[PDB]
Symmetry: C2
Subunit: 199 residues, 2 copies
C-alpha cells in the first residue's frame, strides 16, 4: 500500500531454510550483503537479484547476518552502521518493495509480512540500522542491529509514535490501531493516520 | 478522494460555500482567529463557513485568489500560523474538506493530488506556517497555490529529478507508475516515498 511496486536495485532475494530479503551496500570500502540469520540454512543462502545469483556465507551476531560479495557489479550504496541509540524514520528494503517505518527507543514500527525477514532497515540518510527480523502483523516490529541486540514488540504510546510523523492532527475515525499500541489519543498527525489507514 | 488522503479533515478545516463549494481553514494569525480560503469560491467577497457547531456568513478580504476573514466566534482548534518566508520550499499539507493530502512546494511549482472541492484548502508547511491556499490543478499533481499577496505558481513543467529532491527513501525503479503530463521524465528511478505517492493516484 505504502510499499513501492518494485524493490530497490540493491535489494536481493535470500533463500536458505526459508525465503526472505537482504540488501547490498558499500561498508568500509567493501561490497557486503546483509540479511537475517534465521532465513539462512546454516550460515549459507542463495542470494539472487537482477544480474545476480550466488551462494554466500555470512558472519553472524544474533539474527544479524553479513557477508562479503565482491562479485556484485550493480550499485552498492555507501552505508555505515548508524550510531547505537539512533531513532527516526527509516526504510525497510524488502524483496517486494520499500516500506516506510519508524525506529524508536526500544521499538520498531512498520507494516511487514512473510518474505520480509532480512530486509535492511536504513535511515533517511542511508545509514544502516539493522535488518528486519519479524513482526506481530500489526506494525509492531522486531529489528536486529549488527551488534545482535534487537527490539521486541513492546507496548508503545500512540502519542510517542506520532512524534515521528508530520502533518496536522486529524481524527483517527474508524481506523483500527494495533493491540500493542497504547491508545492515549483519538487525534494523530495526518501522515500517521494515512499510514495506519493503509493497513 | 485524492491519493494519500486522510479519511477525515484536520480539526481546523471548514466547508466554504459561496458561488461554489470549497474548503477553508481556521488559524490564529496575529493573535486573531481568522479563516482563509480561495477568493473564487466566494459570492462577491462572502461565503457561508461551517464546521461542527459552527455556521456563519463571513466577509473576506481578498487579494488575487487569496481570501481571509475574521471569525472570532470559532470555538474549535485554530493553530497559530505565520506566513512562511518568500522562496520557501519543502514538504507541505493541503487541508481539504475531505481530508489532509501531502504535497510539495517547489521553486515556482506545487505538487499535490487534488480535485474538485479542494479549492480554498490551506497549504501549510510541516512546521505549521501558511504557504497559501489551494487554487486548482491539472488533476495529475501539477498545482496552483496562491500566497497571501495574491502571487501564485503556475503549472509549469518540472523535471522528475527536481521533484525527487523533496522525497526521502532509497532510489527505486518506476514500475507501472504513470507520472503526470506536466512532468518531464528525466530518470527512471525515484526515491521510494515519491514512487509510492505517484503510484497511489487512481486511474
Amino acid at each position: 500500500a505504502f510499499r513501492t511496486q518494485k524493490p530497490s536495485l540493491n535489494t536481493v532475494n535470500v533463500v536458505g531454510s526459508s525465503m526472505g530479503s537482504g540488501g547490498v551496500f558499500t561498508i568500509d570500502g567493501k561490497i557486503k550483503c546483509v540479511t537475517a540469520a534465521h532465513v539462512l540454512t546454516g550460515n549459507s543462502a542463495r542470494v539472487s537479484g537482477v544480474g545476480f545469483n550466488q551462494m554466500l556465507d555470512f558472519d553472524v551476531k544474533g539474527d544479524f547476518a553479513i557477508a562479503d560479495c565482491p562479485n556484485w557489479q550493480g550499485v552498492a550504496p555507501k552505508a555505515q552502521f548508524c550510531e547505537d541509540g539512533w531513532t527516526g524514520r527509516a526504510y525497510w528494503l524488502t524483496s517486494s518493495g520499500v516500506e516506510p517505518g519508524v525506529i524508536g527507543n526500544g521499538f520498531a514500527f512498520c507494516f511487514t509480512a512473510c518474505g520480509d525477514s532480512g530486509s535492511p532497515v536504513i535511515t533517511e540518510a542511508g545509514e544502516l540500522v539493522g535488518v528486519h527480523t519479524g513482526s506481530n502483523k500489526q506494525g509492531g516490529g522486531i529489528v536486529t542491529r549488527p551488534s545482535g541486540q534487537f527490539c521486541n514488540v513492546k507496548p508503545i504510546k500512540l502519542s510517542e509514535l506520532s512524534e515521528f510523523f508530520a502533518g496536522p492532527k486529524v481524527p483517527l475515525g474508524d481506523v483500527k490501531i494495533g493491540s500493542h499500541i497504547i491508545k492515549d489519543t483519538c487525534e494523530v498527525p495526518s501522515d500517521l493516520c494515512a499510514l495506519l489507514a493503509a493497513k
